[PDB]
Amino acid sequence: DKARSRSDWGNRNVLPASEGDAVLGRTAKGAVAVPEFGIPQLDDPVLGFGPDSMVDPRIAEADGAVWRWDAGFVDESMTLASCADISDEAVADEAF
Amino acid sequence: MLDAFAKVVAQADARGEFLSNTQIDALSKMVKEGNQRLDIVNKVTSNASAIVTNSARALFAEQPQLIQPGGNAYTSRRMAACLRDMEIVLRYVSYAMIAGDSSVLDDRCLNGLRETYQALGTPGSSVAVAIQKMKDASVALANDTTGTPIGDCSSLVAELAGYFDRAAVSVV
Amino acid sequence: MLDAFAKVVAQADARGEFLSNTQIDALSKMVKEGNQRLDIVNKVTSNASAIVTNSARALFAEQPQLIQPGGNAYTSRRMAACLRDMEIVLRYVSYAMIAGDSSVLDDRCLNGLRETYQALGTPGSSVAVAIQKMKDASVALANDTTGTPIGDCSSLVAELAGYFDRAAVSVV
Amino acid sequence: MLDAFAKVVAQADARGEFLSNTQIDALSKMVKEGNQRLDIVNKVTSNASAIVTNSARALFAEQPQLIQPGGNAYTSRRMAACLRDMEIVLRYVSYAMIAGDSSVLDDRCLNGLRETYQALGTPGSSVAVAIQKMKDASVALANDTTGTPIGDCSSLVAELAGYFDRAAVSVV
Amino acid sequence: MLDAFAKVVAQADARGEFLSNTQIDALSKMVKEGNQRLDIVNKVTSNASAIVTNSARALFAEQPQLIQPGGNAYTSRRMAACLRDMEIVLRYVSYAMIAGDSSVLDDRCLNGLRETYQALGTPGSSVAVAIQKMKDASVALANDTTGTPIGDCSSLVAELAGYFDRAAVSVV
Amino acid sequence: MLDAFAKVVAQADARGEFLSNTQIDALSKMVKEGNQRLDIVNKVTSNASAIVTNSARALFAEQPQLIQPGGNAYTSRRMAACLRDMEIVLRYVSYAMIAGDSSVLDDRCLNGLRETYQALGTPGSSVAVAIQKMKDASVALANDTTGTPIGDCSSLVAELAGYFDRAAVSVV
Amino acid sequence: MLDAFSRVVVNSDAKAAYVGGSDLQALKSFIADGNKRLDAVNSIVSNASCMVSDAVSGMICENPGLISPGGNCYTNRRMAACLRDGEIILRYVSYALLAGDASVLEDRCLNGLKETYIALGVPTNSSIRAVSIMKAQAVAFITNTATERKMSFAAGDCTSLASEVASYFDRVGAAIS
Amino acid sequence: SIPILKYSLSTQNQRVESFEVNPGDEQYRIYSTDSLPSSSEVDQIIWAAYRQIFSEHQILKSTKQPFLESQLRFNQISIKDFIKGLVLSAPFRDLNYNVNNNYRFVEICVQRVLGRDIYNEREKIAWSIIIATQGLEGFIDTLLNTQEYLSNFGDSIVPFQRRRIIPQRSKGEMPFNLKTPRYGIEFRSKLAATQFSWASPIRRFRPQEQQPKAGDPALFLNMVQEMGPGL
Amino acid sequence: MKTPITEAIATADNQGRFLSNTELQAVNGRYQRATASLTAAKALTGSAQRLITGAAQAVYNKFPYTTQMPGPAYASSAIGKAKCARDIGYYLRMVTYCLVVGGTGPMDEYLVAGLEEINRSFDLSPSWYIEALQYIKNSHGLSGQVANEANAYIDYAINTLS
């Protein structure tokens, strides 16, 4: 049944699966929720963070999405990116 | 390692941003919980040998094969190393509770533990039952009101029990 | 490690044979161009800091997202490690130019470097661009006659350009 | 490591049993022929240098491609390492003869040795020929009647022959 | 190493006594001096590169034999060690300021420093001059009321000056 | 370290001599007391905890200043070092009983033990009466016939009491 | 060796400077409060014998294991040495209070005392407690707040002389620690 | 005289400089007798050396060497002799050396004495013949007398896992006690009192791991414990 | 990260221990200081562009050769002035990160480690950045314990460059 008491955190329920199912005012991991976005310093097309800036590897390590026991841990084997491009001539020639 | 205030700094630097007033105001909501977070790790540290041995006693009453001759906790050395494992996991969940997030637990304790137990022949699904029995011994202790002023610390109880859940799905 | 002369002996020992007359005369050809080979490595190590700091400055103007926030050469330490690895690669290339073969460059500079860069998230195709920028900054300087007697040493420059190409293709 | 006596104990502890009376009586039969077991490793140890150097000499007479150029036993360092591999294996067979079982032979000599010779490029079938050449050389010494009272040791000699045979199939 | 609170505890255990109320009330006076003590330590640690560099530059002005060719401070490696030795002593004096007693200045800095300088040929009297020039450079800074509440803290600057005299008579 | 056998051998190599027949006889006499010697060492080893813990309890009862606060055995760090020292003396005496001469006791236990306790502040005359109590507790315990065939065993407990007397004089 | 005036001169001779007027204001108040210093030494020396027999008796009543057989005040030869080990501390402090500088107890008393005491086996934590009691008796005579003896002075304040002598006793404890 | 055979290096973190002035929380706590520690702080050097050579699970009372500890407290042996004395100790030979072969014992002692991983597989092959021909006492002396030991740790520092975390990251390389346990996949089988090699998660009819939904009244329990004073 | 929280965890984990009151007091001292230390980060962020364009102009006043001399290392072009005000904002942003964390964590990882090797290679003189930090140290306008917190990280940056 539902989670009702403080005693249920140690006996019956484990952890919310999404941010909508989380405790009011906190994340799905139990921490306080921060507004996720700050003030961009140094607006500039060539310098400064932009749409073509690369993704720091320490953003997935900070939120813990690099451990296989994490909710947001991505497995890259069964995705559409792992599929062979059928518009390549060496793929349609080998498969034909 | 990261604490909960250094996680938001690392998310903001990987984008070259300042911190807005909405983000600062959410970090001073984390400071105001500061004395209730310190009471929770004090109740876990002060009762730390009754968390471990009451929940190991419970583990062999309902799985008595682990201490029968031929089991994994059968000898005095493998019994002592079994209680060492539970004090180790309880140590790092206690570290992740003052830090505010589980990164010191993730790479110093849980990183490579599931693969360690497979090379030893230790039942990793029974280590998860050991962590789950320390989970509610520690939660029933943190809901206990003795020695504390009056007020609300129920979002912190739900947070402490989530580090015990992360430690228990990482070992099965 | 092996140099060029010790590489020839290693072929001849495995067949259990004395060296021939043509293998002796091929070795006395490498002795004859010894002063032109020593003159190249002197030209490269004397400008070794300028090869690195100008080939880096051309890389961050060509690929400007490497110094933007989130880029792989963004912080003081990530910027100083890029200039470190270019100096390491250029150092072992200078070692392989006096030896005569790439045995020291393969063994103690390049072994496992591709897998090191994949694990860090460092773009290995960008490291290859910066090595090729160091290649023609060194080849253009090795072809400069200011201080040397006039003559043709273009076979040695085509050998130095192959050590840079070897390190460029075994890093991505 | 275990001897023949602690092999029975470690098997009995995993069942939680005392030793049965037919297990004590099978152990006291080992003590009855204990003097003849010691006379076997007295003959093998006292001629251990001649077992290695006579069977190595016969290995290269019949496998003359090991010591030709390019062969695995061609250099001074590669040939002296072939001699000490035979002296290592002959040493760990005699450790398995006074112990009674092949637990020191398997754990300390033969574990992971087939994969080591595959990484080195050593022909593992020829190492088995050298072990079999040491087998009959020390069986011929074990059946010598000089300096002993005449009796039947034929079950002990057939056990020493099984230790060399186990070493020869564990290496190819 | 000890602080001032454990100095009075190591002396009460050696006679098996509880601390009397006078020793407790003398310790609680040290606690309410605590914010003024952290101001002095903050005032030194934030000017630390200018305490060292100015009192060095004032030392080779009045003693030009130190940096003249042949002097103890003449070369870059010996000039770098004279600046390290000034920074080390100022570091361990500020360590003994937050502690309240000089047990950390004594063992891990000053024990064996007259013996070390006599082994190398460093003029130990010139080192005492440089320590007394960092003393009145930082006694003058702790008497500065910029950004502090104006109260009285003359008893802790007489304490901080005593740790500089302790290090200056210990090298001569 | 030497036993009674290799002591006589080592005194003959210095002269370059064989062993005389009157020394093979005196070495064969102590072989015939072999079983009587092993019974003494087995008695002292089997009561090793009760020899020490009774002699220590009888030591602090007559010298109560060793444990009252500020004494040399007042703290559990120092008190466990005192009990450790008493069973180092007992352990090295029974090594000398097995060998036959005090060379292992004289070298790696007694040489420098007087200078060690002087340099620490330990009263060496109190370690003497801690050794004298273990002598009378273990020559009375090697003089009872429970378990041993009654012959005569008095020439060897005069030797065992001679090793305790050697240890009690080299602590002052 | 070096009093309050010799301390000024050796710090001006380091700079080869003349002792002018801005550095003579610490020495014009040394003399202006000169009768109070002589009134402060007189309150220590006049009852120094009682100050020692109370300090080492007060050390023994707190640590009664010093006079047990094996303690460091056991014999009559050991207790007589302790009764002057702590009478020579009070003597060199009253030289330092008289001269206004610590360069006589740190050069004739405190130098190498910690090596001397652990060569003999003297417990230093009890030697500091004997000195600590004498420091409490010293400030109770500079200020006229002794319980069993009041002395006859003029009216005023000596809290700078009371804290100077309490800083001379603290470097004795900092030397054997 | 049979020199060691040549192996190739590999790229590692410790072969290359970190720029790292003012280190942080992942700096790994030099334990040295060059800082003149007292009795309470030489206990911490001893526990750190037990943790490094043994596991944390082998710091039992029956494992501790009380006489090797007292020769370190009297300045008779250095920390390099304490580390050598723990490897040649009787508990280390019984619990670690007897349940490994010669190739996995080299990589335990490289990871724990030198503080770095092996370069390649041939480095295990190169050192495992120092054990088989000279013993453990000869192998640990030629490993402590390399220039890799005397430059990093010297003779008065406890070893540590050198350069485990890159300075920007929060997740670093695996710790060497979790990466290499006491025995491995060989000796596991039945040679170390084991069975069945895996286990499914424990089933139960009271589920114990239910996920709270979006309308569950335990996600609002704050303020349920306590309200304002009343004004 | 040189937070007071992660220094307490690392202190307990060095000796394999639970967190006693030795380490909970270090965490508690962070929370008592976090009030003044978070109003400083809010006020420095709100005056960011005022302090950045002001401190850039103070470097061009004291060092006017940096706007005249040709070469890539100087602010004598439109790109050299964009990269100069980029670097003032880098030093300002790391100060505010240290104020929301407590302790000199972000400045050591992101700014100080490797800075000496960068300033030698690209010929960037560290006296320019000292002058830029001395401007912000005098012009942020804060007072009390809020300026006392802010200046402790401006001064920590000056000691690394000096």
Ligand SMILES: *CC[C@H]1/C(=C/c2[nH]c(/C=C3N=C(/C=C4\NC(=O)C(CC)=C4C)C(C)=C\3CCC(=O)O)c(CCC(=O)O)c2C)NC(=O)[C@@H]1C
């Ligand atoms: C009741 C517990 C279960 C159990 C445990 C058990 N574990 C071991 C052995 C090891 N445990 C670890 C784990 C860690 N090491 C670390 O450093 C950390 C983080 C700080 C963790 C979590 C390791 C590395 C080992 C093996 C190394 C060693 O023991 O030296 C053992 C003993 C194995 C043996 O036989 O030697 C036991 C018995 N076993 C059970 O049955 C319970 C379910």
Ligand SMILES: *[C@@H](C)[C@H]1/C(=C/C2=NC(=C\c3[nH]c(C[C@H]4NC(=O)C(C=C)=C4C)c(C)c3CCC(=O)O)/C(CCC(=O)O)=C2C)NC(=O)[C@@H]1C
């Ligand atoms: C002397 C202090 C004792 C005592 C000693 C005697 N023992 C005699 C014979 C004996 N002792 C042993 C045990 C010994 N041998 C071993 O192999 C081991 C350990 C594995 C031990 C402890 C054996 C086996 C024997 C029998 C051999 C023999 O007969 O010599 C003995 C001889 C009898 C006599 O002549 O009196 C003596 C004196 N006996 C004592 O009464 C005191 C207390």
Ligand SMILES: *[C@H](C)[C@H]1/C(=C/C2=NC(=C\c3[nH]c(C[C@H]4NC(=O)C(C=C)=C4C)c(C)c3CCC(=O)O)/C(CCC(=O)O)=C2C)NC(=O)[C@@H]1C
């Ligand atoms: C929550 C699960 C508990 C509970 C917690 C509360 N604690 C409150 C105040 C408080 N707690 C401490 C101790 C803590 N601070 C430290 O510095 C250290 C270490 C030395 C520890 C263990 C102190 C000192 C204080 C006083 C702070 C104050 O006076 O405000 C508290 C007060 C309410 C509030 O702060 O808003 C609560 C609710 N109380 C409970 O009922 C549950 C069981």
Ligand SMILES: *[C@H](C)[C@H]1/C(=C/C2=NC(=C\c3[nH]c(C[C@H]4NC(=O)C(C=C)=C4C)c(C)c3CCC(=O)O)/C(CCC(=O)O)=C2C)NC(=O)[C@@H]1C
């Ligand atoms: C080809 C890439 C160059 C070039 C090379 C030549 N160098 C010649 C002679 C020469 N070079 C050196 C420099 C070098 N040799 C050393 O021993 C040392 C350091 C100790 C260094 C740095 C020396 C000393 C000599 C003198 C020997 C001689 O005169 O031959 C040279 C002459 C002919 C030849 O050696 O075959 C050539 C062609 N010259 C060029 O035009 C390009 C730029």
Ligand SMILES: *[C@H](C)[C@H]1/C(=C/C2=NC(=C\c3[nH]c(C[C@H]4NC(=O)C(C=C)=C4C)c(C)c3CCC(=O)O)/C(CCC(=O)O)=C2C)NC(=O)[C@@H]1C
């Ligand atoms: C078996 C391959 C031999 C053989 C062996 C026999 N030896 C017998 C007794 C015996 N064996 C030894 C050698 C060994 N025992 C030791 O204690 C030591 C050194 C510590 C060694 C090297 C000795 C000294 C003895 C004498 C003891 C005794 O006489 O029992 C033996 C039993 C004697 C018998 O049957 O009469 C046998 C059968 N005999 C053979 O024919 C093959 C060649």
Ligand SMILES: *[C@H](C)[C@H]1/C(=C/C2=NC(=C\c3[nH]c(C[C@H]4NC(=O)C(C=C)=C4C)c(C)c3CCC(=O)O)/C(CCC(=O)O)=C2C)NC(=O)[C@@H]1C
């Ligand atoms: C002494 C030589 C100085 C001086 C010291 C004073 N500080 C006074 C109060 C005070 N100081 C601080 C800052 C300090 N506390 C911290 O926790 C930290 C670091 C995080 C620091 C730097 C605070 C917060 C306070 C207020 C609390 C209190 O009142 O104790 C103070 C009291 C005023 C007076 O009575 O004069 C003094 C004397 N002030 C000086 O004038 C000299 C230069």
Ligand SMILES: *[C@H](C)[C@H]1/C(=C/C2=NC(=C\c3[nH]c(C[C@H]4NC(=O)C(C=C)=C4C)c(C)c3CCC(=O)O)/C(CCC(=O)O)=C2C)NC(=O)[C@@H]1C
């Ligand atoms: C009583 C307060 C102590 C204590 C005192 C003992 N001191 C002993 C010997 C001793 N003390 C000194 C230092 C003394 N001589 C000086 O010149 C100065 C300063 C100018 C001082 C403080 C020395 C040099 C000696 C050596 C022996 C001697 O010459 O008399 C001592 C040893 C007596 C003995 O061993 O027979 C004692 C007992 N010891 C205590 O336990 C309390 C705490």
Ligand SMILES: *[C@H](C)[C@H]1/C(=C/c2[nH]c(/C=C3N=C(/C=C4\NC(=O)C(CC)=C4C)C(C)=C\3CCC(=O)O)c(CCC(=O)O)c2C)NC(=O)[C@@H]1C
């Ligand atoms: C610079 C042009 C490119 C770049 C470089 C970059 N590399 C690293 C990190 C490492 N580089 C090494 C390299 C070596 N180690 C060796 O032992 C040898 C010789 C055998 C080499 C060449 C290693 C081990 C590391 C990781 C450890 C460390 O960083 O010290 C970084 C590190 C920062 C990061 O998080 O990646 C950087 C920035 N990156 C680029 O973007 C350029 C294309």
Ligand SMILES: *[C@H](C)[C@H]1/C(=C/c2[nH]c(/C=C3N=C(/C=C4\NC(=O)C(CC)=C4C)C(C)=C\3CCC(=O)O)c(CCC(=O)O)c2C)NC(=O)[C@@H]1C
């Ligand atoms: C000789 C009969 C055959 C032969 C031998 C040969 N061996 C090697 C090299 C090694 N052999 C070992 C063997 C062991 N290591 C162990 O730890 C144990 C017990 C578990 C054994 C039995 C090892 C480690 C090596 C490598 C050591 C080294 O490289 O020096 C070689 C290699 C020589 C070389 O330089 O590569 C040779 C030639 N090979 C033959 O041809 C004979 C059939």
Ligand SMILES: *[C@H](C)[C@H]1/C(=C/c2[nH]c(/C=C3N=C(/C=C4\NC(=O)C(CC)=C4C)C(C)=C\3CCC(=O)O)c(CCC(=O)O)c2C)NC(=O)[C@@H]1C
């Ligand atoms: C500078 C004002 C004066 C000066 C200094 C000087 N010192 C050295 C050399 C050493 N100093 C030490 C001291 C320490 N090392 C430590 O690790 C610690 C902390 C415990 C201390 C206190 C040591 C060991 C040396 C020798 C090692 C080294 O060379 O670095 C030198 C160099 C002497 C030389 O010849 O190498 C100098 C120049 N000298 C002066 O003239 C100034 C008065």
Ligand SMILES: *[C@H](C)[C@H]1/C(=C/c2[nH]c(/C=C3N=C(/C=C4\NC(=O)C(CC)=C4C)C(C)=C\3CCC(=O)O)c(CCC(=O)O)c2C)NC(=O)[C@@H]1C
């Ligand atoms: C402005 C005050 C002065 C100035 C600036 C200037 N800087 C550069 C180049 C660089 N500056 C940095 C500094 C950092 N990078 C970082 O990631 C961090 C921490 C977050 C810092 C402090 C670096 C790495 C470079 C080189 C790469 C880049 O372009 O950013 C230049 C260009 C120099 C060149 O050769 O390209 C200039 C002009 N110079 C002045 O004259 C002003 C006085």
Ligand SMILES: C=CC1=C(C)[C@@H](Cc2[nH]c(/C=C3N=C(/C=C4\NC(=O)[C@H](C)[C@H]4CC)C(C)=C\3CCC(=O)O)c(CCC(=O)O)c2C)NC1=O
């Ligand atoms: C076990 C036995 C025992 C004692 C003997 C006393 C000893 C004693 N007296 C004082 C404390 C003092 N002792 C004196 C000494 C004297 N006052 C005079 O009038 C005389 C001239 C002189 C004694 C002959 C003075 C002046 C003080 C401080 C003021 C006072 O307490 O009277 C202190 C200080 C407390 C401290 O800081 O440690 C102690 C331990 N207490 C004890 O427990």
